[PDB]
Write an enzyme that holds these catalytic residues in place. Structure first.
Site, PDB file in Angstrom:
ATOM      1  N   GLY A  26       0.795  -1.209   0.000  1.00 51.51           N
ATOM      2  CA  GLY A  26       0.000   0.000   0.000  1.00 51.51           C
ATOM      3  C   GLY A  26       0.832   1.265   0.000  1.00 51.51           C
ATOM      4  CB  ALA A  29       2.563  10.398   4.165  1.00 47.19           C
ATOM      5  CB  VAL A  33       4.730   0.729   1.996  1.00 41.60           C
ATOM      6  CG1 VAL A  33       5.428  -0.156   3.034  1.00 41.60           C
ATOM      7  CG2 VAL A  33       4.703   2.202   2.474  1.00 41.60           C
ATOM      8  CE  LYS A  48       6.269   7.095   2.695  1.00 40.29           C
ATOM      9  NZ  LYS A  48       6.004   8.099   3.775  1.00 40.29           N
ATOM     10  CG  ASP A 163       1.719   8.455   7.046  1.00 40.73           C
ATOM     11  OD1 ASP A 163       0.883   7.866   6.332  1.00 40.73           O
ATOM     12  OD2 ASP A 163       2.950   8.315   6.887  1.00 40.73           O
TER      13      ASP A 163
END
Ligand SMILES: Nc1nccc(-c2c(-c3ccc(F)cc3)ncn2C2CCNCC2)n1
Ligand SMILES: N[C@]12C[C@H]3C[C@H](C[C@H](C3)C1)C2
Ligand SMILES: [Ca+2]
Ligand SMILES: [Ca+2]
Ligand SMILES: [Ca+2]
Ligand SMILES: [Ca+2]
EC number: 2.7.11.24
Length: 348
Positions: A26, A29, A33, A48, A163
């Site tokens: 998914g 920010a 990832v 990420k 985040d």
């Protein structure tokens, strides 16, 4: 290290051979990832890749901000860094940043959705959010958009906040935002995040979203039905005359007794919700105060609720050129020191 290339989420990732079996889990920010296997330690990690980290001054400062914040965060309930890497051999080549943390398989929406949660389990989940918040708040960092999708959870219900402290300059849910944030009131403090905890905790207890408003105005009306019409003092915080006139013209509503709203809940849960879901942000309980509340008595441990080291945010007021942010970010990549694999000891 030898790097390899793999197309993930329609773009090429370039990662050290240390990290294997990448698979997408998914977006985050400003990046996407992948889960991976760290062959150095046998641990599962999340990697990420920042998206376009230096495309403009906004991206460049955002990239520096995120790397600085994550390098500082050293708390079991807050996302922190195991590694940071770039395929770049020098600053001149530097255009991609990858951040690595422990893998957390789920978010809080995965925990509550298909599960009738016990009160003891809700206590543990909220306790961990508050422990993470005490830490970030102690470093003068506010999340400002805390919500279930920003709480990463693993297979044993261990939770980390992520985040946070991002944004200065996609449709997000506003159901958990503090009223002073959603409505752009002129001042607010760290307790914006405590409102969000109240909204999350309410939903973990009842299985239903607390304030599922269709727009800003509908959401405000739902909030006022629970907490009651605010006094004139609250209008002090609102710049827009049209907004103040609207709120002032609403038919007055009494505050509800939360015991009649959260029927069957632990009375200690109801009492804590009463202390979090207050419009007056100067009257709202703090994270550190909430950790002392009897609702968490079976988890609370003052020796294990630490604060953060001082965090220097002076860069936030500064306008630098893209290449300056880029070089500062490269410096932070190169100076990163991975933490020990085992950073904890048995208590006493
Ligand atoms: N699965 C998992 N595990 C840990 C973190 C994340 C993660 C990160 C992230 C941040 C910093 C970092 F260094 C590495 C990854 N950013 C967003 N997410 C989300 C991806 C999907 N929603 C929940 C978590 N995802
Ligand atoms: N979710 C609720 C919205 C509104 C306030 C409170 C009681 C009712 C009406 C349901 C919570
Ligand atoms: Ca303990
Ligand atoms: Ca240990
Ligand atoms: Ca552990
Ligand atoms: Ca102890």
């Amino acid at each position: 290290p030898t790097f390899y290339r793999q197309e993930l989420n329609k773009t090429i990732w370039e990662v050290p051979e240390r990290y294997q079996n990448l698979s997408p889990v998914g977006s985050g920010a400003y990046g996407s990832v992948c889960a991976a296997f760290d062959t150095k330690t046998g641990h599962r990690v999340a990697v990420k890749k920042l998206s376009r980290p230096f495309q403009s001054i906004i991206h460049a400062k955002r990239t520096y901000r995120e790397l600085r914040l994550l390098k500082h965060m050293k708390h079991e309930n807050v996302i922190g860094l195991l590694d940071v890497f770039t395929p770049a051999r020098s600053l001149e080549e530097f255009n991609d940043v990858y951040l690595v943390t422990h893998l957390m398989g789920a978010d809080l929406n995965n925990i509550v959705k298909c599960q009738k949660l016990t009160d003891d389990h809700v206590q543990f989940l909220i306790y961990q959010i508050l422990r993470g918040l005490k830490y970030i708040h102690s470093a003068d960092i506010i999340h400002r958009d805390l919500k279930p999708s920003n709480l990463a959870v693993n297979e044993d219900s261990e939770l980390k906040i992520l985040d946070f402290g991002l944004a200065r300059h996609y449709v997000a849910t506003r159901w958990y935002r503090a009223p002073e944030i959603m409505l752009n009131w002129m001042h607010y403090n760290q307790t914006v995040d405590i409102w969000s905890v109240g909204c999350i905790m309410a939903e973990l207890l009842t299985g239903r979203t607390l304030f599922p408003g269709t727009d800003h105005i509908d959401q405000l009306k739902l909030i006022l039905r629970l907490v009651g019409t605010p006094g004139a003092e609250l209008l002090k915080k609102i710049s827009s005359e049209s907004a103040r006139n609207y709120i002032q013209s609403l038919a007055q509503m009494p505050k509800m007794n939360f015991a009649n709203v959260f029927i069957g809940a632990n009375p200690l849960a109801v009492d804590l919700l009463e202390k979090m879901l207050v419009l007056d942000s100067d009257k709202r309980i703090t994270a550190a105060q909430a950790l002392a509340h009897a609702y968490f008595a079976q988890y609370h441990d003052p020796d294990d609720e630490p604060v953060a080291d001082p965090y220097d945010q002076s860069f936030e007021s500064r306008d630098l050129l893209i290449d300056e942010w880029k070089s500062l970010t490269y410096d932070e990549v190169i100076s990163f020191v991975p933490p020990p694999l085992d950073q904890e000891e048995m208590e006493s």
